[PDB]
Amino acid sequence: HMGKVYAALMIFDFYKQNKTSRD
């Protein structure tokens, strides 16, 4: 039930892995 949050956060964190800082 808390599973869905876990998964959203994995994508959330995958986004973090893919960040590029300031122009």
Add this chain to the structure above:
Amino acid sequence: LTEEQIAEFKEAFSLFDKDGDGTITTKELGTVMRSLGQNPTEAELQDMINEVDADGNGTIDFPEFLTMMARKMKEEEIREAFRVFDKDGNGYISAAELRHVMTNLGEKLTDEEVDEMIREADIDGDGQVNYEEFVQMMT
């Protein structure tokens, strides 16, 4: 893999897939990222997708979505995730705090569902999720 955890993945996929069309776009990713306090750029969103876009169609289907999760599975990020939920900074995610985030993600939850969720991540039984308990869940 178990039935239950397929269902949870499926619920998560559906949180991202706001228009229900079975595919997640950069717009849908951006929208969820922003509802969680982030501010992704067009390029960042495209990179994320590109990393797991096995078929090069530019959108995320269900297996690619699982593959995103698998990759991240292979700390400072966890403290940040944590702060998204722990909004009064007190070190404990309450049920109301969990609810507030779920609502901002567009999820409709019964009181009982929210408590069930806190109860799954809660380890010491104090009825909230502290930081180390959030780490275990992310782990």
